[PDB]
């Protein structure tokens, strides 16, 4: 779990909580209340609290005096399992948070009538939510749908959850220190009624899926902040996505990664055909077009990048970065020819639009003329140094052009997409592209689910979509596209 993350605490509350409810080796993570975008790792040692800053400007979580990571879970996992790397500070005992805010099933101040509508309309068998009790302030209510699939056969069931002396119960039996512990217990051990109805908690109720028509209303709802609630609930689910990255950790592949600990998952990684099969890259299939999310090239991986492009039959490359070296120049100068190991790349022509440069590249394998094909490299140049674009028109027009290019090429491979780490901008672009392609094919009358789409992408490469600003920007981009339609 990710219960070590406390989203609503101050730094004083963090200290007092570690000093009273913790011991030496206890830790918690928390958002920087002063500077939103940043986080803090507060750890206890020798009867005292030490606070370590973690910045995320959009590319990666940068631990101050430490390594760079794709998620906070992957960060915590690394230092719990690699002793003496954090300087010496040991992470031993995660101080768990009681606050239900960032759980999928928690709906806050939601009325009883409006909870019943949602379960009738959107819910199915085992769909549940927890809400603050209208009657008794302090108490909560667990509303569960049961039965089949107007119809008759299904039904809603409410269950009062009493708060007595800082612990929670359903009117009998065990008393839990948090609503999470309560809900997770009755997931495992369903309540059965007197006439044999099993009150199963199969899935939380989906309220993030919208019809694309009502995007403007939902953005208006999320602005009055509701964007934070939706985003930090998504962040809490990253503990489900700690899949193995063993191949990126091998000694043979250590210097092939730009960021040592931002690694590709084994089950989705691009395998190239002593240890010559590795590249820090992942196939992203939506759940029809696909993508490869990868890092910006190092000097020592340019040959591998071109082998990947060739192997995968990729015809479109989206580069999304223009005072640091985020990428090494892996393409020849205009009109020039280069050999990158066994691969050969001519730059036929460059074309400047306002937001981007297009480079027409002819890729072939050395010794084989018949292997040639055109790769169209779209270099996006107007992404700001700090934050996200204030208007999404540029990204949308860019992606529209990129899409029409890919669609013009018969049996083209996945669209290669990269930035610095291959997770922030790369993830924000790919997700915008997934959501826009839904609307493009099936029109304004179709359902879309922003955080679900991100989670599905996050399960294929670590930490795809990095910040709340990028999360907000995806919404704003999808909104702008529907308005300009
Ligand atoms: C204090 C307070 C007041 S209202 C509120 C909440 C958050 N608990 C209520 C509950 C509904 N919700 C949600 C619901 N599904 C969310 C997904 C999500 C959606 C689909 C699949 C997956 Cl895998 C995920 Cl991870 N991410 N983010 C989500 N947020 C937003 C709002 N909290």
Short mmCIF file of C-alpha atoms and ligand atoms in Angstrom, two decimals:
data_model
loop_
_atom_site.label_atom_id
_atom_site.label_comp_id
_atom_site.label_asym_id
_atom_site.label_seq_id
_atom_site.Cartn_x
_atom_site.Cartn_y
_atom_site.Cartn_z
CA UNK A 1 0.00 0.00 0.00
CA UNK A 2 0.71 3.78 -0.23
CA UNK A 3 -0.73 4.67 3.23
CA UNK A 4 2.62 6.29 4.20
CA UNK A 5 1.47 9.27 2.02
CA UNK A 6 -0.45 11.87 4.10
CA UNK A 7 -2.08 14.40 1.67
CA UNK A 8 -3.60 16.92 4.18
CA UNK A 9 -0.91 17.23 6.93
CA UNK A 10 1.23 20.29 7.67
CA UNK A 11 4.94 19.97 8.64
CA UNK A 12 4.17 20.55 12.36
CA UNK A 13 1.48 17.80 12.26
CA UNK A 14 4.06 15.56 10.45
CA UNK A 15 6.61 16.06 13.26
CA UNK A 16 4.16 15.60 16.17
CA UNK A 17 2.72 12.46 14.43
CA UNK A 18 6.22 10.89 13.95
CA UNK A 19 7.28 11.85 17.55
CA UNK A 20 4.08 10.44 19.22
CA UNK A 21 2.69 7.61 16.93
CA UNK A 22 6.14 6.60 15.49
CA UNK A 23 9.61 5.38 16.52
CA UNK A 24 13.18 5.51 15.05
CA UNK A 25 12.94 4.44 11.37
CA UNK A 26 9.37 5.74 10.99
CA UNK A 27 8.58 7.85 7.94
CA UNK A 28 5.86 9.56 5.99
CA UNK A 29 5.61 11.44 2.69
CA UNK A 30 3.53 14.61 2.18
CA UNK A 31 2.80 17.43 -0.34
CA UNK A 32 4.63 20.74 0.12
CA UNK A 33 1.86 23.01 1.44
CA UNK A 34 4.00 26.14 0.71
CA UNK A 35 5.09 25.24 -2.87
CA UNK A 36 2.53 22.94 -4.65
CA UNK A 37 4.32 20.61 -7.08
CA UNK A 38 6.90 19.70 -4.39
CA UNK A 39 6.74 16.97 -1.70
CA UNK A 40 8.56 16.15 1.58
CA UNK A 41 9.90 12.87 3.06
CA UNK A 42 9.75 13.33 6.88
CA UNK A 43 11.77 10.53 8.65
CA UNK A 44 12.44 9.85 12.38
CA UNK A 45 15.97 9.03 13.69
CA UNK A 46 17.64 9.17 17.19
CA UNK A 47 14.44 10.70 18.68
CA UNK A 48 14.28 13.54 16.09
CA UNK A 49 12.54 14.29 12.75
CA UNK A 50 14.50 15.02 9.49
CA UNK A 51 12.65 16.48 6.44
CA UNK A 52 13.97 15.67 2.93
CA UNK A 53 12.64 17.80 0.03
CA UNK A 54 11.50 16.12 -3.25
CA UNK A 55 10.84 18.37 -6.31
CA UNK A 56 8.85 17.38 -9.40
CA UNK A 57 8.97 20.05 -12.12
CA UNK A 58 7.25 17.65 -14.61
CA UNK A 59 9.96 15.14 -15.69
CA UNK A 60 10.68 13.02 -12.57
CA UNK A 61 10.67 13.13 -8.74
CA UNK A 62 14.12 14.50 -7.81
CA UNK A 63 15.11 13.57 -4.24
CA UNK A 64 17.39 16.27 -2.87
CA UNK A 65 20.81 14.70 -2.19
CA UNK A 66 19.51 11.44 -3.71
CA UNK A 67 18.38 9.74 -6.94
CA UNK A 68 15.59 10.55 -9.47
CA UNK A 69 12.37 8.43 -9.60
CA UNK A 70 9.21 7.82 -11.67
CA UNK A 71 6.83 7.56 -8.71
CA UNK A 72 7.00 8.12 -4.92
CA UNK A 73 6.12 4.41 -4.42
CA UNK A 74 9.11 3.38 -6.56
CA UNK A 75 11.19 5.88 -4.51
CA UNK A 76 10.06 4.40 -1.13
CA UNK A 77 10.51 0.83 -2.47
CA UNK A 78 14.12 1.62 -3.55
CA UNK A 79 15.30 3.09 -0.20
CA UNK A 80 13.48 0.51 2.00
CA UNK A 81 15.30 -2.20 -0.06
CA UNK A 82 18.66 -0.35 -0.60
CA UNK A 83 20.01 0.43 2.89
CA UNK A 84 22.55 3.28 3.32
CA UNK A 85 21.79 5.07 0.00
CA UNK A 86 19.81 7.88 1.70
CA UNK A 87 22.33 10.02 3.74
CA UNK A 88 22.69 7.64 6.73
CA UNK A 89 18.87 7.60 7.08
CA UNK A 90 16.92 4.27 7.19
CA UNK A 91 13.25 3.95 6.10
CA UNK A 92 11.95 1.10 8.32
CA UNK A 93 8.30 1.61 9.42
CA UNK A 94 5.79 3.39 7.13
CA UNK A 95 3.61 5.63 9.35
CA UNK A 96 0.18 4.90 7.83
CA UNK A 97 -2.42 7.62 7.21
CA UNK A 98 -6.01 7.28 8.49
CA UNK A 99 -7.47 9.96 6.18
CA UNK A 100 -9.97 8.52 3.60
CA UNK A 101 -9.68 11.56 1.17
CA UNK A 102 -7.53 9.81 -1.50
CA UNK A 103 -9.56 6.51 -1.63
CA UNK A 104 -11.68 5.75 -4.77
CA UNK A 105 -14.71 4.72 -2.68
CA UNK A 106 -14.74 7.89 -0.48
CA UNK A 107 -17.18 10.58 -1.76
CA UNK A 108 -17.07 13.07 1.18
CA UNK A 109 -20.09 15.34 1.75
CA UNK A 110 -22.47 13.55 -0.62
CA UNK A 111 -26.22 13.41 0.24
CA UNK A 112 -28.15 10.13 0.64
CA UNK A 113 -30.53 10.76 -2.28
CA UNK A 114 -27.64 11.63 -4.67
CA UNK A 115 -25.66 8.51 -3.62
CA UNK A 116 -28.71 6.35 -4.47
CA UNK A 117 -29.13 7.98 -7.95
CA UNK A 118 -25.51 7.25 -8.82
CA UNK A 119 -25.68 3.57 -7.71
CA UNK A 120 -28.96 3.10 -9.65
CA UNK A 121 -27.67 4.81 -12.83
CA UNK A 122 -23.90 4.12 -12.91
CA UNK A 123 -23.45 1.24 -10.42
CA UNK A 124 -23.78 -2.52 -10.89
CA UNK A 125 -23.47 -5.61 -8.56
CA UNK A 126 -20.90 -4.99 -5.79
CA UNK A 127 -20.51 -1.26 -6.60
CA UNK A 128 -19.98 0.73 -3.38
CA UNK A 129 -19.19 4.11 -1.86
CA UNK A 130 -18.63 5.66 1.57
CA UNK A 131 -19.97 9.13 2.39
CA UNK A 132 -20.30 11.45 5.40
CA UNK A 133 -23.56 10.85 7.32
CA UNK A 134 -26.16 13.60 6.71
CA UNK A 135 -27.76 12.87 10.17
CA UNK A 136 -24.87 12.26 12.59
CA UNK A 137 -21.79 14.53 12.08
CA UNK A 138 -18.66 12.38 12.58
CA UNK A 139 -20.39 9.19 11.35
CA UNK A 140 -20.30 7.74 7.82
CA UNK A 141 -22.55 5.58 5.59
CA UNK A 142 -21.54 2.69 3.29
CA UNK A 143 -23.92 2.44 0.31
CA UNK A 144 -23.72 -0.91 -1.62
CA UNK A 145 -25.58 -2.13 -4.71
CA UNK A 146 -26.50 -5.82 -4.91
CA UNK A 147 -28.48 -8.20 -7.19
CA UNK A 148 -28.54 -8.60 -10.98
CA UNK A 149 -26.14 -7.17 -13.66
CA UNK A 150 -36.34 0.00 -13.34
CA UNK A 151 -35.66 -3.78 -13.64
CA UNK A 152 -36.78 -4.87 -10.08
CA UNK A 153 -34.12 -7.52 -9.25
CA UNK A 154 -31.26 -5.26 -7.97
CA UNK A 155 -31.23 -3.04 -4.85
CA UNK A 156 -29.24 -0.47 -2.84
CA UNK A 157 -28.30 -1.18 0.80
CA UNK A 158 -27.04 1.54 3.23
CA UNK A 159 -24.93 0.59 6.31
CA UNK A 160 -24.35 3.15 9.08
CA UNK A 161 -20.69 3.47 10.16
CA UNK A 162 -20.45 4.92 13.63
CA UNK A 163 -17.47 6.87 14.86
CA UNK A 164 -16.98 6.22 18.61
CA UNK A 165 -13.79 7.53 20.31
CA UNK A 166 -11.65 7.78 17.13
CA UNK A 167 -12.52 4.20 15.89
CA UNK A 168 -15.04 2.98 13.26
CA UNK A 169 -17.62 0.14 13.24
CA UNK A 170 -20.82 -1.16 11.57
CA UNK A 171 -22.75 -1.39 14.88
CA UNK A 172 -21.01 -4.59 16.08
CA UNK A 173 -17.87 -6.73 16.15
CA UNK A 174 -14.42 -5.31 15.40
CA UNK A 175 -13.68 -1.56 15.69
CA UNK A 176 -11.14 -0.17 13.17
CA UNK A 177 -8.64 2.73 13.45
CA UNK A 178 -9.58 3.96 9.90
CA UNK A 179 -12.42 3.70 7.33
CA UNK A 180 -9.83 2.11 4.99
CA UNK A 181 -9.18 -0.72 7.48
CA UNK A 182 -12.98 -1.06 7.89
CA UNK A 183 -13.66 -1.18 4.11
CA UNK A 184 -10.70 -3.54 3.41
CA UNK A 185 -11.97 -5.90 6.16
CA UNK A 186 -15.50 -6.10 4.70
CA UNK A 187 -14.01 -6.49 1.17
CA UNK A 188 -12.26 -9.63 2.50
CA UNK A 189 -15.14 -10.62 4.88
CA UNK A 190 -18.49 -9.50 3.33
CA UNK A 191 -21.43 -8.63 5.61
CA UNK A 192 -24.33 -11.02 5.10
CA UNK A 193 -27.93 -9.96 5.92
CA UNK A 194 -30.43 -12.14 7.89
CA UNK A 195 -32.08 -13.45 4.65
CA UNK A 196 -28.73 -14.38 2.98
CA UNK A 197 -27.84 -11.31 0.85
CA UNK A 198 -24.04 -10.97 0.74
CA UNK A 199 -23.05 -7.26 0.77
CA UNK A 200 -20.00 -7.66 -1.51
CA UNK A 201 -17.68 -4.68 -2.08
CA UNK A 202 -16.52 -5.71 -5.58
CA UNK A 203 -15.56 -2.28 -6.99
CA UNK A 204 -15.84 1.43 -6.06
CA UNK A 205 -18.48 3.49 -7.92
CA UNK A 206 -17.14 5.18 -11.07
CA UNK A 207 -17.84 8.96 -11.15
CA UNK A 208 -14.85 10.04 -13.33
CA UNK A 209 -16.15 8.55 -16.64
CA UNK A 210 -18.02 11.30 -18.50
CA UNK A 211 -19.74 11.58 -21.82
CA UNK A 212 -17.40 13.85 -23.91
CA UNK A 213 -20.33 16.29 -24.54
CA UNK A 214 -20.31 17.28 -20.82
CA UNK A 215 -16.48 17.89 -20.60
CA UNK A 216 -17.05 21.67 -20.15
CA UNK A 217 -19.39 21.08 -17.17
CA UNK A 218 -17.00 18.55 -15.52
CA UNK A 219 -13.98 20.93 -15.87
CA UNK A 220 -16.24 23.63 -14.34
CA UNK A 221 -17.08 21.18 -11.49
CA UNK A 222 -13.40 20.23 -10.98
CA UNK A 223 -12.31 23.94 -10.93
CA UNK A 224 -14.57 25.21 -8.06
CA UNK A 225 -10.04 22.14 -5.82
CA UNK A 226 -11.67 19.01 -7.30
CA UNK A 227 -8.74 18.42 -9.72
CA UNK A 228 -6.51 17.71 -6.67
CA UNK A 229 -8.98 15.20 -5.19
CA UNK A 230 -9.17 13.28 -8.49
CA UNK A 231 -5.36 13.41 -9.08
CA UNK A 232 -4.25 12.39 -5.53
CA UNK A 233 -6.77 9.48 -5.61
CA UNK A 234 -5.03 8.36 -8.84
CA UNK A 235 -1.58 8.78 -7.19
CA UNK A 236 -2.70 6.50 -4.28
CA UNK A 237 -3.20 3.65 -6.82
CA UNK A 238 0.46 3.73 -8.07
CA UNK A 239 1.30 1.08 -5.37
CA UNK A 240 -0.60 -1.38 -7.65
CA UNK A 241 1.97 -0.63 -10.43
CA UNK A 242 5.29 -1.69 -8.78
CA UNK A 243 5.99 -4.32 -11.47
CA UNK A 244 9.51 -5.65 -11.98
CA UNK A 245 12.25 -3.73 -13.83
CA UNK A 246 14.99 -6.37 -13.46
CA UNK A 247 16.54 -5.94 -16.94
CA UNK A 248 17.24 -2.20 -16.46
CA UNK A 249 19.06 -3.02 -13.14
CA UNK A 250 21.51 -5.51 -14.73
CA UNK A 251 25.17 -4.38 -14.74
CA UNK A 252 25.32 -4.73 -18.56
CA UNK A 253 22.40 -2.24 -18.92
CA UNK A 254 23.24 0.29 -16.09
CA UNK A 255 24.95 2.89 -18.38
CA UNK A 256 22.09 2.54 -21.01
CA UNK A 257 19.68 4.49 -18.72
CA UNK A 258 19.67 8.29 -18.53
CA UNK A 259 18.19 8.11 -15.03
CA UNK A 260 19.54 5.06 -13.06
CA UNK A 261 16.24 4.23 -11.27
CA UNK A 262 13.67 5.26 -13.94
CA UNK A 263 13.44 1.86 -15.62
CA UNK A 264 11.12 0.17 -18.14
CA UNK A 265 8.79 -2.61 -16.86
CA UNK A 266 9.92 -6.07 -18.08
CA UNK A 267 6.51 -7.17 -19.40
CA UNK A 268 6.07 -4.18 -21.85
CA UNK A 269 9.68 -3.26 -22.67
CA UNK A 270 10.91 -3.09 -26.22
CA UNK A 271 13.19 -6.09 -26.72
CA UNK A 272 15.77 -5.55 -29.46
CA UNK A 273 16.56 -8.55 -31.77
CA UNK A 274 26.80 -9.59 -24.70
CA UNK A 275 23.43 -8.14 -23.52
CA UNK A 276 22.41 -6.36 -26.76
CA UNK A 277 18.55 -6.69 -26.36
CA UNK A 278 17.96 -3.72 -23.95
CA UNK A 279 16.57 -0.23 -24.48
CA UNK A 280 14.87 2.09 -21.91
CA UNK A 281 11.58 1.95 -23.81
CA UNK A 282 8.06 0.51 -23.45
CA UNK A 283 5.20 -0.38 -25.83
CA UNK A 284 2.03 1.54 -24.82
CA UNK A 285 -1.14 -0.17 -26.17
CA UNK A 286 -4.50 1.50 -25.32
CA UNK A 287 -7.39 -0.62 -23.86
CA UNK A 288 -6.16 0.93 -33.25
CA UNK A 289 -2.88 2.91 -32.80
CA UNK A 290 0.01 2.24 -30.36
CA UNK A 291 3.08 4.12 -29.00
CA UNK A 292 6.63 3.60 -27.67
CA UNK A 293 7.42 5.78 -24.65
CA UNK A 294 11.20 6.20 -24.24
CA UNK A 295 13.92 8.47 -22.80
CA UNK A 296 15.92 11.13 -24.60
CA UNK A 297 19.03 9.54 -26.13
CA UNK A 298 22.39 9.18 -24.44
CA UNK A 299 25.53 9.17 -26.62
CA UNK A 300 25.93 5.42 -25.95
CA UNK A 301 22.28 4.45 -26.96
CA UNK A 302 21.76 6.25 -30.34
CA UNK A 303 22.54 3.04 -32.30
CA UNK A 304 20.00 1.16 -30.11
CA UNK A 305 17.30 3.85 -30.64
CA UNK A 306 17.62 3.46 -34.45
CA UNK A 307 17.53 -0.37 -34.24
CA UNK A 308 14.30 0.01 -32.19
CA UNK A 309 12.73 2.34 -34.76
CA UNK A 310 13.72 -0.08 -37.57
CA UNK A 311 12.60 -3.25 -35.77
CA UNK A 312 9.24 -1.82 -34.73
CA UNK A 313 8.51 -0.32 -38.23
CA UNK A 314 7.93 3.09 -36.54
CA UNK A 315 7.36 5.87 -39.08
CA UNK A 316 6.67 8.82 -36.70
CA UNK A 317 8.85 10.19 -33.88
CA UNK A 318 7.46 12.81 -31.47
CA UNK A 319 10.27 14.63 -29.63
CA UNK A 320 8.85 16.95 -26.95
CA UNK A 321 11.85 18.93 -25.59
CA UNK A 322 13.78 21.89 -27.08
CA UNK A 323 19.25 25.06 -19.16
CA UNK A 324 20.26 21.36 -19.21
CA UNK A 325 20.95 18.57 -21.77
CA UNK A 326 17.62 16.62 -21.84
CA UNK A 327 18.54 14.80 -25.14
CA UNK A 328 21.60 14.12 -27.37
CA UNK A 329 21.13 14.97 -31.11
CA UNK A 330 20.50 11.57 -32.72
CA UNK A 331 19.58 12.72 -36.27
CA UNK A 332 21.88 14.07 -39.05
CA UNK A 333 22.03 17.73 -40.13
CA UNK A 334 19.74 18.80 -43.02
CA UNK A 335 20.75 17.01 -46.27
CA UNK A 336 23.48 14.98 -44.50
CA UNK A 337 23.82 11.21 -44.29
CA UNK A 338 25.05 9.32 -41.17
CA UNK A 339 25.61 5.71 -40.15
CA UNK A 340 24.59 4.83 -36.58
CA UNK A 341 26.11 1.34 -36.30
CA UNK A 342 24.27 -0.95 -38.78
CA UNK A 343 21.60 1.72 -39.48
CA UNK A 344 21.79 4.60 -41.95
CA UNK A 345 19.82 7.89 -41.70
CA UNK A 346 19.55 10.67 -44.31
CA UNK A 347 17.93 13.96 -43.34
CA UNK A 348 16.05 14.67 -46.61
CA UNK A 349 14.44 17.97 -45.54
CA UNK A 350 13.51 20.07 -42.47
CA UNK A 351 10.31 22.22 -42.31
CA UNK A 352 9.55 24.89 -39.66
CA UNK A 353 6.01 25.37 -38.35
CA UNK A 354 5.49 27.79 -35.42
CA UNK A 355 5.22 25.20 -32.63
CA UNK A 356 7.43 22.45 -34.20
CA UNK A 357 10.13 21.41 -36.70
CA UNK A 358 9.45 18.45 -39.02
CA UNK A 359 12.52 16.43 -40.22
CA UNK A 360 12.00 13.98 -43.12
CA UNK A 361 14.40 11.09 -42.40
CA UNK A 362 15.12 8.05 -44.61
CA UNK A 363 16.06 5.07 -42.41
CA UNK A 364 17.68 1.90 -43.85
CA UNK A 365 19.89 -0.99 -42.79
CA UNK A 366 23.49 -0.79 -44.11
CA UNK A 367 24.00 -3.20 -47.06
CA UNK A 368 20.26 -3.46 -47.92
CA UNK A 369 18.67 -0.77 -50.17
CA UNK A 370 15.23 -2.46 -50.14
CA UNK A 371 14.96 -1.85 -46.34
CA UNK A 372 14.49 1.96 -46.72
CA UNK A 373 11.46 3.83 -45.32
CA UNK A 374 10.59 7.41 -44.36
CA UNK A 375 10.54 8.35 -40.66
CA UNK A 376 8.90 11.73 -39.95
CA UNK A 377 10.44 13.37 -36.88
CA UNK A 378 8.14 15.98 -35.25
CA UNK A 379 10.21 18.07 -32.86
CA UNK A 380 7.81 20.07 -30.57
CA UNK A 381 9.66 23.28 -29.56
CA UNK A 382 7.19 25.60 -27.72
CA UNK A 383 6.73 23.60 -24.43
CA UNK A 384 7.60 26.07 -21.59
CA UNK A 385 10.66 25.57 -19.35
CA UNK A 386 8.47 25.63 -16.19
CA UNK A 387 4.95 24.11 -16.07
CA UNK A 388 2.59 23.28 -18.98
CA UNK A 389 1.29 25.25 -22.04
CA UNK A 390 -1.29 27.89 -21.00
CA UNK A 391 -3.21 27.20 -24.26
CA UNK A 392 -3.51 23.60 -25.62
CA UNK A 393 -4.13 24.69 -29.30
CA UNK A 394 -0.47 24.13 -30.23
CA UNK A 395 -0.27 20.61 -28.80
CA UNK A 396 -3.65 19.69 -30.39
CA UNK A 397 -2.76 21.04 -33.86
CA UNK A 398 0.62 19.26 -33.51
CA UNK A 399 -0.99 15.93 -32.53
CA UNK A 400 -3.62 16.32 -35.30
CA UNK A 401 -0.84 16.65 -37.88
CA UNK A 402 1.14 13.76 -36.27
CA UNK A 403 -2.04 11.63 -36.38
CA UNK A 404 -2.83 12.37 -40.04
CA UNK A 405 0.78 11.52 -40.92
CA UNK A 406 0.60 8.10 -39.11
CA UNK A 407 -2.80 7.39 -40.72
CA UNK A 408 -1.47 8.17 -44.23
CA UNK A 409 1.23 5.43 -43.89
CA UNK A 410 -0.06 1.85 -44.46
CA UNK A 411 0.92 -0.76 -41.79
CA UNK A 412 3.06 1.78 -39.88
CA UNK A 413 4.49 0.71 -36.53
CA UNK A 414 4.02 2.43 -33.15
CA UNK A 415 4.53 6.16 -32.80
CA UNK A 416 7.84 6.76 -30.97
CA UNK A 417 7.37 9.48 -28.29
CA UNK A 418 10.14 10.93 -26.02
CA UNK A 419 11.17 13.72 -23.64
CA UNK A 420 13.88 13.63 -20.86
CA UNK A 421 12.90 10.62 -18.68
CA UNK A 422 10.11 9.43 -21.06
CA UNK A 423 7.27 9.75 -18.46
CA UNK A 424 6.09 13.40 -17.88
CA UNK A 425 5.62 15.12 -21.23
CA UNK A 426 5.77 11.77 -23.07
CA UNK A 427 2.87 10.54 -20.90
CA UNK A 428 0.89 13.78 -21.16
CA UNK A 429 1.18 13.73 -25.02
CA UNK A 430 0.31 9.98 -25.36
CA UNK A 431 -2.75 10.29 -23.06
CA UNK A 432 -4.03 13.43 -24.85
CA UNK A 433 -3.55 11.47 -28.11
CA UNK A 434 -5.46 8.44 -26.78
CA UNK A 435 -8.40 10.61 -25.58
CA UNK A 436 -8.57 12.71 -28.77
CA UNK A 437 -8.49 9.57 -30.99
CA UNK A 438 -11.60 8.25 -29.13
CA UNK A 439 -13.47 11.51 -29.85
CA UNK A 440 -12.18 11.60 -33.47
CA UNK A 441 -13.34 8.04 -34.35
CA UNK A 442 -16.58 7.71 -32.29
CA UNK A 443 -17.60 11.45 -32.11
CA UNK A 444 -18.78 13.59 -29.16
CA UNK A 445 -21.32 10.91 -28.11
CA UNK A 446 -18.93 8.54 -26.33
CA UNK A 447 -17.66 7.94 -22.78
CA UNK A 448 -14.12 8.92 -21.72
CA UNK A 449 -12.37 8.40 -18.36
CA UNK A 450 -9.25 10.50 -17.78
CA UNK A 451 -7.65 8.90 -14.66
CA UNK A 452 -8.63 5.36 -15.83
CA UNK A 453 -6.85 6.02 -19.16
CA UNK A 454 -3.75 7.30 -17.24
CA UNK A 455 -3.73 4.25 -14.89
CA UNK A 456 -3.94 1.91 -17.90
CA UNK A 457 -0.90 3.77 -19.39
CA UNK A 458 0.90 3.88 -16.00
CA UNK A 459 0.69 0.04 -15.91
CA UNK A 460 2.79 -0.10 -19.13
CA UNK A 461 5.47 2.46 -18.21
CA UNK A 462 6.26 3.83 -14.74
CA UNK A 463 4.89 7.24 -13.74
CA UNK A 464 3.28 8.22 -17.04
CA UNK A 465 1.89 11.74 -16.34
CA UNK A 466 3.99 13.38 -13.61
CA UNK A 467 2.14 16.43 -12.15
CA UNK A 468 -1.29 17.87 -11.31
CA UNK A 469 -0.63 20.65 -13.90
CA UNK A 470 -0.20 18.03 -16.63
CA UNK A 471 -3.32 16.21 -15.29
CA UNK A 472 -5.27 19.53 -15.51
CA UNK A 473 -3.74 20.18 -18.97
CA UNK A 474 -4.96 16.82 -20.36
CA UNK A 475 -8.56 17.81 -19.35
CA UNK A 476 -8.10 21.33 -20.83
CA UNK A 477 -6.70 19.82 -24.06
CA UNK A 478 -9.61 17.36 -24.44
CA UNK A 479 -12.09 20.23 -23.65
CA UNK A 480 -10.49 22.58 -26.24
CA UNK A 481 -10.64 19.82 -28.91
CA UNK A 482 -14.38 19.21 -28.31
CA UNK A 483 -15.10 23.00 -28.41
CA UNK A 484 -13.12 23.32 -31.71
CA UNK A 485 -15.13 20.57 -33.48
C1 LIG B 1 -12.61 14.55 0.02
C2 LIG B 1 -13.31 14.19 -1.26
C3 LIG B 1 -14.42 14.81 -1.63
S1 LIG B 1 -14.93 14.12 -3.16
C4 LIG B 1 -13.59 13.05 -3.17
C5 LIG B 1 -13.29 12.04 -4.26
C6 LIG B 1 -11.96 11.28 -4.05
N1 LIG B 1 -12.02 10.33 -2.92
C7 LIG B 1 -14.56 11.33 -4.78
C8 LIG B 1 -14.58 9.84 -5.14
C9 LIG B 1 -14.59 9.74 -6.65
N2 LIG B 1 -13.26 10.24 -7.10
C10 LIG B 1 -12.39 9.47 -7.92
C11 LIG B 1 -12.78 8.23 -8.52
N3 LIG B 1 -11.94 7.56 -9.29
C12 LIG B 1 -10.70 8.00 -9.51
C13 LIG B 1 -9.59 7.47 -10.28
C14 LIG B 1 -9.68 6.21 -11.06
C15 LIG B 1 -10.77 6.05 -11.93
C16 LIG B 1 -10.92 4.89 -12.70
C17 LIG B 1 -9.98 3.87 -12.61
C18 LIG B 1 -8.90 4.04 -11.74
CL1 LIG B 1 -7.73 2.78 -11.62
C19 LIG B 1 -8.74 5.19 -10.97
CL2 LIG B 1 -7.37 5.34 -9.93
N4 LIG B 1 -8.60 8.31 -10.14
N5 LIG B 1 -8.98 9.38 -9.33
C20 LIG B 1 -10.27 9.22 -8.92
N6 LIG B 1 -11.13 9.91 -8.14
C21 LIG B 1 -13.10 11.71 -6.96
C22 LIG B 1 -13.79 12.28 -5.70
N7 LIG B 1 -12.89 13.26 -2.10
#
